[PDB]
Design an enzyme around this catalytic site. Structure first.
Site, PDB file in Angstrom:
ATOM      1  N   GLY B  41      20.920 -96.485 -49.434  1.00  0.00           N
ATOM      2  CA  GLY B  41      21.901 -95.525 -48.985  1.00  0.00           C
ATOM      3  C   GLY B  41      22.141 -94.481 -50.047  1.00  0.00           C
ATOM      4  N   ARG B 329      47.957 -93.224 -40.448  1.00  0.00           N
ATOM      5  CA  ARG B 329      46.900 -93.871 -39.680  1.00  0.00           C
ATOM      6  C   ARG B 329      47.201 -95.344 -39.446  1.00  0.00           C
ATOM      7  NH1 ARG B 329      43.309 -94.043 -43.834  1.00  0.00           N
ATOM      8  NH2 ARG B 329      44.809 -95.605 -44.571  1.00  0.00           N
ATOM      9  N   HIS B 400      36.528 -99.538 -40.512  1.00  0.00           N
ATOM     10  CA  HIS B 400      35.646 -98.458 -40.925  1.00  0.00           C
ATOM     11  C   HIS B 400      35.015 -98.702 -42.286  1.00  0.00           C
ATOM     12  CE1 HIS B 400      34.094 -94.472 -41.560  1.00  0.00           C
ATOM     13  NE2 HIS B 400      34.902 -94.269 -42.581  1.00  0.00           N
TER      14      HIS B 400
END
Ligand SMILES: Cc1cc2nc3c(=O)[nH]c(=O)nc-3n(C[C@H](O)[C@H](O)[C@H](O)COP(=O)(O)OP(=O)(O)OC[C@H]3O[C@@H](n4cnc5c(N)ncnc54)[C@H](O)[C@@H]3O)c2cc1C
Ligand SMILES: Cc1cc2nc3c(=O)[nH]c(=O)nc-3n(C[C@H](O)[C@H](O)[C@H](O)COP(=O)(O)OP(=O)(O)OC[C@H]3O[C@@H](n4cnc5c(N)ncnc54)[C@H](O)[C@@H]3O)c2cc1C
Ligand code: SF4
Ligand code: SF4
Ligand code: F3S
Ligand code: F3S
Ligand code: FES
Lengths: 257, 631, 127, 111, 131
Positions: B41, B329, B400
């Site tokens: 990545g 959030r 997430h």
């Protein structure tokens, strides 16, 4: 929805493959295509059969490893999307969907629907970069890139490396992938020192990897998830003509490891 | 005992001081060292490319078709840097302060300052690499504002910044593969870590096309393997994202730093059925011009546009009157989960809430709203089949990011010498909450401008070579991996791998998710081993070992997830406080915000595997704040 | 189109002394409008051409030059100025002796922009 | 009483310290503010352009036909900067010393 | 350039005849007092450029007023004005406030008084005497 699937089933690289028929009695219109394949795989596993193998990581149309030839079209009937972004509301009740891998000499099939797209990796390794090392970069605002050039280079750089251009190309050519990378790097001032070498190398690598030539047909652009234009191939053609005028000759090909 | 190995003196020079005091490997001596980099990545690709440029022998691995197929290709938001190109008060100190305060004072200060300080070099490197960042009409770079910042410090490449960052890193990695310094092994999954004489001296991998188990030896091992957010089945991560590498390293001796620190995303497209496992997230800014509601009647079969306003439960407006319509959030998403758990049925499975834009469309210009959220609305209509302009858009929270991971010191080295963890795989410097556009910057910093120095410091103090794959440790690890694969294939149970993963993720999302309490975490701690035993007795993994068996890879990942979830629940039960993403219902302000206990929990919890999954050993790493005082 | 704070070091981009001198010759325009007044057509060609030449002789004006000329020329049409017959009264009365070479440079830029298919933007309407 | 509000510590970091310690307006909240700028000279035009770039609503005024007719246009000598492009001992500290001594020690050092 | 300009303005060539010069007031480094934030004694009033006292002391160096104006505009006021604005709420004052009406009435009365004097001396005569 009641959906019939004719899916390519190949055991490995050497084993010949064939179409197997699978009937799915209940298919959600909101189900994505890969989710429907997942439901089929769960059913096959519960029934004692081998589940269908297909490549998928992101399910967002960005990573680029979902690669399915659905009903004769790469990434399915709907354009500017990927296989993962295709949902079953694009089909009808009683429809028959033929699912295939990418067919190309340079994209060997490893399993039922999985191909080996490492030829794209080796095309990139053959000059699809800017030979800048870490620590040597100047300030990020030292070289101005016009918003138009940056936008065009981002349009070309938006390439998820799915290989659907190769799959939809009648010649099996990687010209849209190669041209997209060539255009992305050639539209920026950082890609100028190598561009005429790079295109040649990359084009030669695409020849070495076993891809076909470009007849300017345009199925690559028709099935591209990112709507990479045929102007990328025109730009690559201009770069190659300019490199031939300068006598640029390709380096040694990138041999697989 | 954990040694953070942070430098002394003023924080603004610590990294430079460290870089001077670190040992070096001569360029001629670098060719004698082999470094394994598991992961391709942003962190892994940047690290392998930089180490190949340096002159080391690099062995890079990934389970995907290509190194470019990694996660972090999906990162939509930009990448932050303290360049102050917008003349808006931004600085390296302001970015460091913002990241320390955003993480709720739960990370080391020196790490955060070093990250904020090298962000500028990151942006320079990416622009040099050809990353097509947004430019203004005059030719110079363009910045935008990300959440958690009052400055415009985010560099973006349209809505696919992470794709272009990973493309630059992958192009550098391809350049090094062509140069022969890096050996890339795609479709190869690291299944174990081999520790020889207390040093991470190799890995055991499985080629997922031919099924072959291979052992590789190296002088150092880097774990750039991303996060473990898929322990919750429903998450925004890619389908293959797993915790196998970091969990195997943890079982080998690496300490897990704050495993319970998990982040969520509020705006994610909900699932259409039990089959789906991925939630496609959407910018948190979508909420800025939308209202969250559900029908008051649970059995409302009417179209959501035909429901009258007096018949809509506009929660987050009646609840939390202060800071309405822009509730944080975590508060909004906990409310959403509570509403969906109560039973509403606004979506297919009932897990979703109506984020409508009708009043914003009427109030504002529909063309301006198109300019704001055109790509998002088109993607939502592609995925769901419903136009958000007329029909309300259904959303549901999803896991997430995981701020936790393997504990690393200032040198990015775990508690196993020679094992380096970078990117999302380590705890590092996000604390209890990762700021927006900071994971991309952290991965690229670890890859490009930190690990090249700290790994050279480690390697200069050891002799190259001396460990081959014929050592008994490699044979023992390989035998263990083979036995595990044979056992997984030989169970021949009734339930599928995804069924167990779905059950485990449901339990983790209900108990160790966004709202955590003592009783729920204790119930989860009782239930996790039962699910693990049921998995090991009743899972169906068809196929053979020496084949492209995707069910086998999923089975191995879920087998690691079942053990990791117990540690996560234990860590969450341990931390008797709320901080950032870790929220305990019994430790909160009356507004619902996180209430920290800085007197007793101002540390990093690194957990040691003791052979018992239910009783890991807690090691506290105390946190001292000299520049950003907790408040 | 450079915002404050984003400028690089002042010596990052070399501008040749000849180009700098020519761009300073064009940039020395006091905006009096005497070119419009003395032009038989009432045209703002010398003013527009001076600005186009000033920004087109420097590297910093390269990223947006072919747009700029088109926009500027279109704006001069939109505002009500006449066309250029290449008469030269504008250069005869210019206080700063801005030459007709500026108009030739603007013409070259506009032809090059037409070859690139550059379309003028929306005109600047008065406030 | 007059509060100069000058920062503390070493003079070389004072401005940076001040820039960290002073509050910010979010770019989304800048459109809510209106700033009047009377004047379009070097100072006024610079301020109005920068504040419009930031995202504020700016009302700029001048008594002339055009903003370009301000008296800064009439300045003939160059503009100073402590870039030491000539290798002649110039520095930011030397410019600060030259300006403090030239003003005859009648201005604040931090400014 | 100087000799050509002098010959344009006076009509005398300085290559043969002496040039004639006379001192004139040029700059004012006084002005409204401002703090480090470039803010005057009135909160919300910022004075930049030559209009403030600021940092030229008792004598402004050459090439420093352009420096100061461009510095105040580009790299100081954007920060200090944001610092001021972040501590107050936007809006809340319209031109219908009584203060606006009082200031406007004062300005109108001043203009009417100036136009209504109808004396025997011009404005520039008084300005010349004052200067
Ligand atoms: C939709 C989305 C948007 C995001 N947007 C942002 C954003 O705007 N800003 C931001 O800062 N962050 C963002 N993130 C988060 C961030 O981009 C990444 O999630 C993460 O920080 C990067 O992970 P990494 O570089 O450490 O490794 P990854 O990108 O996760 O890659 C890990 C690699 O390990 C390889 N691998 C090989 N063997 C193994 C093994 N055995 N086990 C595991 N892995 C193995 C994999 O193949 C893969 O290549 C976003 C995430 C998502 C999902
Ligand atoms: C002939 C001359 C030569 C100079 N040469 C140099 C030099 O070589 N180097 C140097 O460093 N300095 C020089 N200076 C000094 C420097 O240029 C001045 O300090 C400069 O004028 C400062 O600009 P400013 O933005 O502060 O104001 P100005 O440039 O004077 O602009 C003031 C602006 O405010 C507007 N305005 C004023 N009152 C009102 C009102 N009531 N309502 C509305 N608008 C109003 C005006 O229209 C104008 O746009 C020179 C000065 C002069 C006079
Ligand atoms: S050019 Fe388009 S079709 Fe070809 S690999 Fe790239 S994204 Fe896929
Ligand atoms: S006459 Fe000369 S100085 Fe005056 S506006 Fe025209 S070009 Fe500019
Ligand atoms: S379809 Fe084939 S012929 Fe060329 S333009 Fe596309 S690669
Ligand atoms: S006189 Fe007029 S016609 Fe053109 S060359 Fe000058 S503007
Ligand atoms: S799975 Fe990533 S592009 Fe489809």
């Amino acid at each position: 929805m009641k959906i019939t699937l004719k899916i390519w089933r190949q055991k490995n690289r050497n084993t010949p493959g064939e179409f197997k028929t699978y009937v799915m009695d209940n298919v959600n219109p909101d189900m994505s295509f890969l989710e429907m394949l997942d439901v089929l795989n769960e059913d096959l596993m519960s029934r004692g059969e081998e589940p269908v193998a297909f490549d998928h990581d992101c399910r967002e149309g960005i990573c680029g490893m979902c690669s399915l030839m659905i009903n004769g079209v790469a990434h399915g009937p709907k354009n500017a999307i990927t296989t993962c972004q295709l949902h079953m509301r694009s089909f009808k009740d009683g429809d028959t969907i033929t699912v295939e891998p990418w067919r190309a000499s340079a994209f060997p099939i490893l399993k039922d629907l999985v191909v080996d797209r490492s030829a794209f990796d080796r095309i990139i390794q053959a000059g699809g970069y800017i030979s800048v090392s870490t620590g040597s970069a100047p300030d990020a605002n030292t070289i101005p890139v016009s918003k138009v050039a940056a936008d065009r280079a981002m349009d070309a750089a938006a390439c998820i490396g799915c290989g659907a251009c190769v799959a939809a190309c009648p010649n099996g050519s990687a010209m849209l992938f190669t041209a997209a990378k060539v255009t992305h790097l050639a539209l920026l001032p950082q890609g100028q020192p190598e561009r005429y070498q790079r295109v040649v190398n990359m084009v030669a690598q695409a020849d070495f990897e076993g891809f076909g030539n470009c007849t300017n047909i345009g199925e690559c652009a028709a099935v591209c998830p990112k709507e990479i234009s045929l102007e990328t191939i025109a730009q690559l053609n201009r770069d190659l003509v300019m490199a031939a005028l300068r006598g640029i000759e390709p380096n040694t090909p990138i041999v697989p490891a | 005992v954990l040694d953070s190995k942070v430098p002394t003196g003023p924080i603004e020079q610590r990294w430079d001081k460290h870089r001077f005091e670190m040992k070096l490997v001569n360029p001629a001596n670098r060719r004698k060292y082999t470094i394994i980099v598991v992961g391709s990545g942003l962190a892994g690709a940047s690290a392998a490319a930089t180490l190949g440029e340096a002159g080391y022998n690099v062995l890079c691995f990934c389970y995907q078709d290509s190194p470019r197929r990694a996660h972090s290709i999906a990162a939509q938001g930009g990448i932050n840097a303290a360049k102050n190109y917008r003349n808006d008060g931004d600085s390296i100190y302001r970015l460091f302060y913002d990241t320390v305060k955003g993480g709720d004072f739960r990370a080391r200060e020196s790490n955060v300052y070093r990250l904020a300080q090298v962000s500028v070099n990151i942006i320079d490197q990416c622009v040099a690499q050809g990353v097509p960042f947004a430019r203004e009409y005059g030719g110079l770079l363009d910045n935008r504002s990300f959440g958690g910042a009052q400055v415009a410090r985010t560099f973006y490449a349209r809505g696919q910044t992470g794709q272009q960052l990973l493309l630059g890193a992958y192009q550098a990695l391809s350049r090094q593969i062509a140069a022969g310094t890096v050996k890339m092994f795609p479709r190869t999954e690291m299944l174990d870590l081999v520790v020889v004489d207390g040093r991470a001296r190799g890995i055991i991998t499985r080629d997922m096309v031919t099924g072959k188990i291979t052992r590789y030896a190296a002088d150092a091992v880097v774990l750039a393997t991303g996060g473990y957010g898929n322990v919750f089945y429903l998450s925004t991560n890619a389908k293959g994202c797993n915790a196998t590498a970091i969990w195997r390293a943890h079982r080998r001796g690496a300490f897990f730093g704050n495993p319970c620190f998990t982040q969520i995303h509020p705006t994610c497209i909900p699932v259409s059925g039990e089959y789906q496992s991925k939630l496609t997230l959407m910018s948190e800014s979508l909420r800025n011009d939308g209202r969250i509601w559900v029908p008051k009647k649970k059995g409302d079969t009417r179209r959501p546009q035909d429901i009258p306003e007096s018949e809509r439960d506009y929660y987050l407006e009646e609840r939390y009157p202060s800071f309405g319509n822009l509730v944080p959030r975590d508060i909004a998403s906990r409310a959403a989960k509570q509403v969906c758990d109560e039973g509403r049925g606004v979506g297919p499975g009932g897990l979703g809430v109506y984020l409508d834009f009708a009043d914003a469309i009427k109030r504002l210009g529909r063309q301006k709203i198109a300019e704001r959220y055109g790509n998002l609305f088109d993607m939502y209509k592609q995925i769901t089949g419903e136009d958000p302009y007329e029909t309300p858009m259904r959303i549901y929270p999803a896991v997430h990011y995981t701020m936790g991971g393997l504990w690393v010191d200032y040198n990015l080295q775990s508690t196993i010498p020679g094992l380096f963890v970078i990117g999302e795989a380590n705890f590092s410097d996000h604390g209890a909450n990762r700021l927006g556009a900071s994971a991309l910057m952290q991965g690229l910093a670890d890859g490009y401008f930190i690990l090249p120095y700290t790994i050279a410091n480690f390697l200069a103090q050891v002799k190259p070579g001396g460990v081959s794959i014929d050592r008994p440790e490699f044979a023992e690890a390989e035998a263990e991996i083979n036995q595990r694969i044979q056992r997984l294939l030989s169970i021949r149970g009734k339930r599928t791998v995804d069924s167990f993963h779905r059950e485990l993720g449901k339990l983790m999302w209900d108990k160790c998710g966004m709202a955590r309490n003592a009783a729920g975490l204790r119930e989860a701690l009782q239930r996790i081993p039962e699910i693990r035993a049921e998995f090991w007795e009743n899972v169906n993994v068809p196929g053979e070992a020496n084949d492209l068996n995707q069910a086998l890879e999923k089975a191995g990942r879920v087998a690691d997830f079942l053990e990791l979830a117990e540690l996560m629940c234990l860590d969450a039960l341990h931390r008797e406080e709320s901080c950032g993403g870790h929220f305990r219902e019994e430790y909160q302000t009356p507004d619902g915000e996180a209430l920290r206990n800085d007197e007793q929990f101002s540390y990093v919890a690194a957990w040691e595997f003791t052979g018992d999954l239910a009783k890991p050993r807690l090691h506290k790493e105390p946190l001292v704040f000299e520049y950003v005082k907790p408040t």
